[PDB]
Amino acid sequence: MESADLRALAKHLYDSYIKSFPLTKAKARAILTGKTTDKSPFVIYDMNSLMMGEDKIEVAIRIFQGCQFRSVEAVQEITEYAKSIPGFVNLDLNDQVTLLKYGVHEIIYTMLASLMNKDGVLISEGQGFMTREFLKSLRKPFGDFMEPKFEFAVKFNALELDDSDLAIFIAVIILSGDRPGLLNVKPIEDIQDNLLQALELQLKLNHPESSQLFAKLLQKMTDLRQIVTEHVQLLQVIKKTETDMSLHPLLQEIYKD
Amino acid sequence: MESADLRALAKHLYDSYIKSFPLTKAKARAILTGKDKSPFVIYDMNSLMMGEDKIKFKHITPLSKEVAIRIFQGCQFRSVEAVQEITEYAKSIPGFVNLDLNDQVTLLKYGVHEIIYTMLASLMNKDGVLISEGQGFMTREFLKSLRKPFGDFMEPKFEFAVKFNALELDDSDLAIFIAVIILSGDRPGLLNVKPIEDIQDNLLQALELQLKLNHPESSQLFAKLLQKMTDLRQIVTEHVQLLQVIKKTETDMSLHPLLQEIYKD
Numbered sequence: 001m002e003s004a005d006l007r008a009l010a011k012h013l014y015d016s017y018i019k020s021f022p023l024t025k026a027k028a029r030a031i032l033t034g035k036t037t038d039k040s041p042f043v044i045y046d047m048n049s050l051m052m053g054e055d056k057i058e059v060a061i062r063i064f065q066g067c068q069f070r071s072v073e074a075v076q077e078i079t080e081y082a083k084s085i086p087g088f089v090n091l092d093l094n095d096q097v098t099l100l101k102y103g104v105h106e107i108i109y110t111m112l113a114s115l116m117n118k119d120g121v122l123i124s125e126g127q128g129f130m131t132r133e134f135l136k137s138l139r140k141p142f143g144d145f146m147e148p149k150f151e152f153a154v155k156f157n158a159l160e161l162d163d164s165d166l167a168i169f170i171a172v173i174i175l176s177g178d179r180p181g182l183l184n185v186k187p188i189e190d191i192q193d194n195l196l197q198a199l200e201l202q203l204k205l206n207h208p209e210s211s212q213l214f215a216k217l218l219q220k221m222t223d224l225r226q227i228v229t230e231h232v233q234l235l236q237v238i239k240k241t242e243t244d245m246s247l248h249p250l251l252q253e254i255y256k257d
Numbered sequence: 258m259e260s261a262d263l264r265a266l267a268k269h270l271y272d273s274y275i276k277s278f279p280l281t282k283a284k285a286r287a288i289l290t291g292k293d294k295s296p297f298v299i300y301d302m303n304s305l306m307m308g309e310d311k312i313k314f315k316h317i318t319p320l321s322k323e324v325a326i327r328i329f330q331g332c333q334f335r336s337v338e339a340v341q342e343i344t345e346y347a348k349s350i351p352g353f354v355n356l357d358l359n360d361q362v363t364l365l366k367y368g369v370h371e372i373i374y375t376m377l378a379s380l381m382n383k384d385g386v387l388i389s390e391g392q393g394f395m396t397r398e399f400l401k402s403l404r405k406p407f408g409d410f411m412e413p414k415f416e417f418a419v420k421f422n423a424l425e426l427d428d429s430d431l432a433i434f435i436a437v438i439i440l441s442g443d444r445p446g447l448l449n450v451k452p453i454e455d456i457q458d459n460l461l462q463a464l465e466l467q468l469k470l471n472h473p474e475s476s477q478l479f480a481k482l483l484q485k486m487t488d489l490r491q492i493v494t495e496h497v498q499l500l501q502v503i504k505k506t507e508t509d510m511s512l513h514p515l516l517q518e519i520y521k522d
């Protein structure tokens with residue numbers, strides 16, 4: 001509840017966010033808008049370019065497993081970031097697990113948007129770019145599993161957040177006192193209140209011409225909760241057809257309840 | 258013409274050290290020496306069962322049921338919090354945040370073990386260790402008597418602590434010492450050693466002056482303190498080898514994968 005302390009917290013979370021995540025939104029936007037010369041991605045738009053892409057950098061399964069593997073790495077990255085949020089590690093250890101269990105998916109979607117435009121998504125640390133049309137054209141259940149990520153990303157990216165905004169936003173999501181099964185809601189909400197104050201000041205200073213960006217950003221936490229539910233529900237259905245798939249135990253545990 | 262600058266740097270680090278760490282050495286010594294508000298003492302299984310039911314130690318609450326495992330992991334979890342505390346303290350060392358971000362991460366990664374040991378001695382005497390911000394006191398004998406490898410994992414910390422505490426450092430000494438450890442130019446993988454050593458050279462100057470003024474009767478205390486970095490590197494190395502033996506033999510260490518992720522380092 002002090003401006004300079006709120007600014008200090010924003011700088012702390014931004015700095016830690018840079019340390020925890022390999023590919024920032026700033027880097028991803030430089031790659032996506034191009035204009036540069038050797039940060040240029042190889043573009044995978046069909047079966048044959050995928051085959052060529054392996055030498056430079058079932059098709060639907062291999063792409064799914066590529067997402068699963070990246071998602072697991074994201075969980076690791078998010079987990080390392082979470083420990084830097086002031087107060088998180090001091091919480092009851094079961095609550096730490098619970099907050100990560102229910103928060104990682106919402107964060108993955110958020111940060112996935114940083115890697116997307118309307119035409120595709122960066123992969124392999126920005127070295128490749130896989131087109132939305134190719135992903136949507138994958139077979140049976142896999143195509144319609146890829147596309148909702150793009151649907152969200154386009155809407156979310158219209159807010160034009162930069163990384164210093166996202167670092168606080170991601171922190172706010174993690175410290176959600178309403179997660180099922182929390183033992184100690186009060187210290188979680190005390191931390192989130194500081195993060196919320198920090199976010200509000202951040203958005204007012206960094207986006208002063210963007211009216212009610214704070215409220216509009218929080219209304220996006222609504223769209224996240226819905227899409228994680230559809231994702232989980234659709235992911236389970238895929239399990240009932242595809243035994244040539246298996247989830248990483250880290251993800252397997254997260255989805256269990 | 259920089260005596261006053263070293264005092265300023267000394268005071269700056271002392272003030273910041275007080276803000277970052279929960280239980281100071283000065284406070285911890287009053288408790289250990291008995292100088293009212295007496296900590297709960299854990300000297301065996303039944304007293305542990307009572308203290309976790311009364312005081313509710315956060316690192317020793319069920320989340321394995323085996324007591325020696327639960328105490329081992331409780332140390333791990335407290336070490337995780339200490340890392341964040343040291344990380345926040347590091348940001349206050351003049352020049353640290355201006356270093357290359359990868360080097361900041363590298364220095365913290367390879368220093369936290371040495372610092373946690375150093376600061377653990379503050380909470381220790383020859384008879385046990387303070388826990389939960391001084392609310393509990395777990396005896397050396399109870400820790401040393403734990404089964405299989407866990408007992409022999411606890412006791413080397415006390416052996417180091419007893420020798421380190423004979424230097425009789427206070428918090429104003431330790432604040433500079435901890436900073437010197439952090440700014441180690443020989444950590445593997447550093448990108449830009451020169452500014453790291455430039456800072457350590459200032460911190461070393463401040464530590465030397467601090468020790469002469471604070472311990473004028475303790476000859477070559479500076480040299481003796483730097484010689485303890487030998488004892489630190491050695492035991493951190495031994496510590497790593499002891500953890501791997503525990504990991505490769507103990508089938509009862511399963512935790513939720515998220516928790517394993519938090520504790521990964």
Ligand SMILES: O=C(O)c1ccc(-c2nn(C(=O)c3c(Cl)cccc3C(F)(F)F)c3ccc(Cl)cc23)c(OCc2cccc3c2OCO3)c1
Nearest residue numbers: 063066067068070071074108109111112121123130146149
């Ligand atoms: O770099 C990243 O930060 C990142 C993050 C997420 C994906 C990605 N996951 N995903 C999932 O379903 C998913 C999600 Cl959201 C959350 C949890 C578990 C899963 C799982 F388990 F079910 F997957 C996607 C679906 C579609 C798209 Cl477009 C991307 C993702 C990510 O994807 C990079 C990527 C995209 C296409 C092909 C790839 C690839 O990496 C290698 O090959 C990056």
Ligand SMILES: O=C(O)c1ccc(-c2nn(C(=O)c3c(Cl)cccc3C(F)(F)F)c3ccc(Cl)cc23)c(OCc2cccc3c2OCO3)c1
Nearest residue numbers: 316328331332333335336370373374377386388395411414
């Ligand atoms: O409050 C503190 O400032 C503190 C600091 C350290 C410990 C503690 N770590 N530990 C380790 O092995 C260890 C060490 Cl040195 C360095 C790096 C990583 C580790 C790790 F990761 F491997 F742990 C100990 C071993 C024995 C003892 Cl005695 C204490 C420590 C500490 O421990 C307090 C504590 C907390 C909960 C249960 C306890 C307990 O002490 C006994 O039971 C506090």
